[PDB]
Amino acid sequence: TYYDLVKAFMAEIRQYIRELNLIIKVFREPFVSNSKLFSANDVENIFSRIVDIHELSVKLLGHIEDTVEMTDEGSPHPLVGSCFEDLAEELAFDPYESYARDILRPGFHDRFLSQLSKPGAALYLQSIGEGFKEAVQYVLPRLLLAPVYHCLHYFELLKQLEEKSEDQEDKECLKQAITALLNVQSGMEKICSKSLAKRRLSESAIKKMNEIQKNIDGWEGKDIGQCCNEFIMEGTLTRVGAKHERHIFLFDGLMICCKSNEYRLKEKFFMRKVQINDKDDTNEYKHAFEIILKDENSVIFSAKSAEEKNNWMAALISLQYRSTRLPSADVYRFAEPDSEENIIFEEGIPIIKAGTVIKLIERLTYHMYADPNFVRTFLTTYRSFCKPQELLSLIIERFEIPEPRFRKEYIQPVQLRVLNVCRHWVEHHFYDFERDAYLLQRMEEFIGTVRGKAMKKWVESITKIIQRKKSPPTVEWHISRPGHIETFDLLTLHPIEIARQLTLLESDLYRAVQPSELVGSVWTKEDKEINSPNLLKMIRHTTNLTLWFEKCIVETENLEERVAVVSRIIEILQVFQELNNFNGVLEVVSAMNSSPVYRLDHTFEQIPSRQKKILEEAHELSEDHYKKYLAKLRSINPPCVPFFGIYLTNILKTEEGNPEVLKRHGKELINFSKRRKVAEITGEIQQYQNQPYCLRVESDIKRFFENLNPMGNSMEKEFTDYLFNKSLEIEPRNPKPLPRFPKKYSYPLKSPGVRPSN
């Protein structure tokens, strides 16, 4: 897919960038350092545009990285067409043609060697360190081809992306990049097709391991796979002293010397020892080198040509040496450095515990890294410590960065994060803008203030989201037919539909609670009916249902029917679990663990095993202080109805368990951290209020559960006592025999099941 190619490309350019670094910092720096031995041109004649190419590459990868991270679920794949088009339009790839021209010129290597053999050069290279002179002479010329391979692949990469793009605007950018690169491509094409160049490029261009050992007779020691990880070379060489030219397989861990008959093992050498170069000798051996093994006798090989010898030394020498800001004045910024008076972290990204709105927003738009999780949490819970209008102002103040240069690794990324926050805000929290027309205006004015010629094209995606913001399963039925309200009851309705409608009811109830009903533990004070009317309406429904389940069970005097009643309820619990309705889960669990229902041993006795496990699995969610429930909530994907109680206890305790004021030097400072902690819980609550249920509403069934009133006109205690005395009546204590009661229901008690029709 387009995305696979991009992932593959990112890994490739990262390895490549590392190779460019090696070339620049390790091989080139020593020539640059010895001004007396090498002039600017000498360096130029060997390394060409290597530095520009490195800069272009880091720039390319950087843009592609931001693009990917800023790619929301709204796109079929990150759109990198523009990353390439912006660069191609500025003729940024021209350095590659010049580079290829310098490196693939016919006389390159000869001139390269003369530079290594002129007075004092060889000695200077040796003084750099062990292996440098050998690496420079036999390995560097190969590495110097990397930019050519890399750029040639670009031409093919762009074509494939163009063909696979799932976005018309992205496709267009790619077509344009391809076009803008035609000159560079035909230019490099002419350079690379010439015979010598073509040979050079071809030169440096575990099923195999087992396939190779299987074709070698008289094997010794362990398998190739038991000491090698890759296959490097396969050629022919002559061992000075041996009778027949040996065929050789070179692995990172083994140089295997065979005799062709297909082959017979002759020498099995372990790669972990020195390799020395040898000058030609009248001894008929030319293009030779010496291999030195541990406590073993040296062996000398000879290749067919100097080109062959070069390929072997390149690989062999590489194997031997394989191991080898200033922001503004603070009086114009967020420049204040981190301290204990700024941010505190929780004891790869650092988790924040507390901090100033300034430092908080700084980390929300941090230059070092992107924090998509911190951005998701902040935009869900910030309204408790910052007002929407103040947030936009702080964001704008964060964007408009004043210069004191290196501000491409600070100004470019910070402005990026700021805009990704704006996108997330408008995308997942548009209610802030529907509620304040001026807030939207300031946002549209700010978006239209973006300067970057390239940034505008990227920011158009944000504008599109703004303009935008301006089939569910069949209703299941059982014994009761649609419209027959009178007949509605726990066993008459379909168990699946009961759980479905209770979930819709319970979801709406949950989504209606405002943070102004929670903040300040307001639902616990004397004016709770006034300040938290939605919260109480939700809790009262939960209570109402827990009680209705108990009443249904306990008032079903006949044991057979009661077992049937307890069974549907467990079934309803199962669908609640499927629908991720935790309020509804704890609703049933609570009824099951109530005093009147808990002790009905005769009832639970006849309840199937699978159902007992579903219930037990449910009860375990509460254990250890909801440890499992808290875990499961995190692990699921909405919609869902969380259990509200835990949030209530956490807000109340956070407010009552932490001071309202911190004292310092006799002065009274307001503990804001405490208020921030409340806002995070509030924020979490609001996040779960977004996603709606893909379920069809059944108005009549909904009205049935909305009008349930188990308690009637009785007070709590009078009713609770009635349930318990009913439990004792239907299942008296031990020594008292279990009486029989007449049937209550005149319809079949067989459940239609929990699996939907089709």
Curated annotation (Swiss-Prot):
Keywords for the protein's UniProt record, in alphabetical order: Disease variant, Guanine-nucleotide releasing factor, Phosphoprotein
N-terminal Ras-GEF domain mapped to chain residues: 348-470
Domain PH: 231-323
Species whose genome carries this gene: Homo sapiens
Protein name: Son of sevenless homolog 1
Domain DH: 1-191
Domain (Ras-GEF) ranges: 494-733
Documented effect of changing G221K: In NS4; requires 2 nucleotide substitutions
Positions spanned in the full protein: 200 to 1044 of 1333
Tissue specificity comment: Expressed in gingival tissues.
Role played: Promotes the exchange of Ras-bound GDP by GTP. Probably by promoting Ras activation, regulates phosphorylation of MAP kinase MAPK3/ERK1 in response to EGF. Catalytic component of a trimeric complex that participates in transduction of signals from Ras to Rac by promoting the Rac-specific guanine nucleotide exchange factor (GEF) activity.
A GO MF label: molecular condensate scaffold activity
Gene name, Swiss-Prot/TrEMBL: SOS1
